[PDB]
Every structure is written in structure tokens, then in C-alpha cells.
């Protein structure tokens, strides 16, 4: 009956940010002090809720979204930001109610010669709406002439590899991110703090 | 019963320094067993953890304050500290601390000319 936060935070594999993973958390007791008292995380930051109240509140559900980005991109995981990640990969709404947690994962997600496994969406016709997810790989039309699904001149694959290398600077190193959203419905609350 | 009070805050000119104190009461011989953290509030109910120290002294900080803020703990005095160097106008906020699951009301820090 303790919420399965460890499955999210301690998962062996993490998604690319364009295909960010979501886990529904419901019908459990959430002790958030396990997270906000951990020295493992460099970022723990809340919006529309105070950490002083986290263990005293009840919610219908909480959503845990996880993924990998650059360190200097962790600032984009917040309301009212723009940039490649917030525009094309993962967008938080102005009225976001939740917390963002992040930590450097250079030891796990970098590889000598460059890691081809983590990617982000480099091209898109328009910005994502908040909490929208796009995992398509349609050839992107950069010129005036259509591509007709064929990669080539002025017609680019929409995903770009981070190519994480362990020797890059800390801002360019991979970071694992978990975003907790707290949902209130006109239904009974099912995730509660220890009280 | 456990309680924490913050102190050492106030007005400071840019580039100045402050040393905040998180003083605990009602802990017996047990203060050392809890983690302790420092947070700052921004308008819009935005709360940023600015420093964390666990029961064995492991620390961490976000990038915005790394190199400028240092958290420390005194298990004999049941007190913790946040050393804030090279303050900036953006560092203006209410700063509050926690010990385990107990929170303080906070104190104001203002960086202005
Ligand atoms: C992720 O795994 C770590 C495993 O070390 C968990 O942290 C440890 O949990 C045990 C039991 O609660 C403690 O004795 C250790 O002191 C913990 N270490 C640290 C560094 O926290 C951690 O709780 C797991 N994450 C989640 C969300 O459950």
C-alpha cells in the first residue's frame, strides 16, 4: 500500500524525452519525504503545492513521467518555459500542480564514442500543447517542396541523437527527470500522505 | 514535540552574504537521525529545494546555487546552516528549512540596492 515510487525513480531503463514514459500512481500511501530528503537529487522543485503540505494532502491520482535530457535542459521542465524540449518534446502547463525531480546520470547514460540510444525531437511543425506526446517519425519538410515520405534533400528525419559522451561538460551530461503531477477530480481521493 | 525556527535573514546588497540558521527544539538526542533541507519560495506557489543534507552528511544542490550556497549541520547544537555567498537579486525569497517531516515558517531574505 506504499506507493511504488522506487519502480519509477530506480528503473534500470529510462525513456528518451520525445517518448517520455508515464506511470499512474493510485490507491496508495505516498511518503514524499523519501524523495525530498534524498541527497541523490540535485533538483526538487514544486509548483502550486508546498513541500510542507505534501505528506498532508490527498489526490485522486498522481502521474509520474520520466525521461532523460541534458542538464542545461532541466530548467525547461517547468511552467512558462520555451526551448527545444518544452516546445517539441515535453511541455508543462502554466497551471502545473506538481514537483520536478532530476539528477545527473552520466555514470549510466553516457557511453564512450557517444550513446546513440537517447534522442529528442529536433523538428516539428508546431509546439506541443501541455502534456502532449509525439512519437511519430514522419520525414520533416524543411523546404517549400514536399518530401512525400522520402528522406533526402531538404527532407530530414525528425529525431536527433544526444550522443552522450562521459567527457562532455556537466551541462551537456545526461540527467534523469521525474515529474509528479497531482490530480484533483470530483471522485474519491486514493493517494494520500502518511498523515 | 519537534519544531524548527529559521533566523539570520534580512536585507543585503548584491554580492553580499548571509548565514541562515535552522534551529531545532524538542529533539532529544535524536536530531542527528533526520535529514535537513533548505527551500526558497517564489511567487505563484513555486518552491525550490536549495540545499539538502542527509543523516551521514551527503549534500546536493541545484545548479542555480551550486558554488554559492553551502549547507552544514551541527548535531551537538541541534542546528543547521545555509551559507549564502555572492547573492543576486534573483535570490530574494522566503527561505525555510525542514528536519525530517517538520517544517519552519521561514524568514525573509531580500537582495536589493
Ligand atoms: C531507490 O533505491 C535506493 C537503494 O539504495 C533507496 O534508498 C535507500 O533505501 C534504504 C531503505 O529505505 C535506506 O536504508 C538507504 O539509506 C536509502 N539510500 C538512499 C541513498 O536513499 C531509495 O529509497 C529508492 N528510491 C525510492 C523512490 O524508493
Author numbering:
A (entry chain A): 334 to 528
B (entry chain B): 1 to 113
What did the paper state?
SARS-CoV-2 initially binds to the host receptor, angiotensin-converting enzyme 2 (ACE2), by the receptor-binding domain (RBD) of its spike (S) glycoprotein to tether the viral particles to the cell surface. Therefore, the RBD of S (S-RBD) is a major target of the host humoral immunity. Here, we report the identification and characterization of two neutralizing nanobodies isolated from an immunized alpaca, Nb-015 and Nb-021, which target two non-overlapping epitopes on SARS-CoV-2 S-RBD. Structural and functional studies reveal two distinct neutralizing mechanisms for Nb-015 and Nb-021. The former recognizes a conserved epitope in the ridge of the S-RBD external subdomain and inhibits viral entry by competing with ACE2 binding, and the latter binds to the inner face of the S-RBD core subdomain and neutralizes viral infection likely by destabilizing the architecture of S trimer.
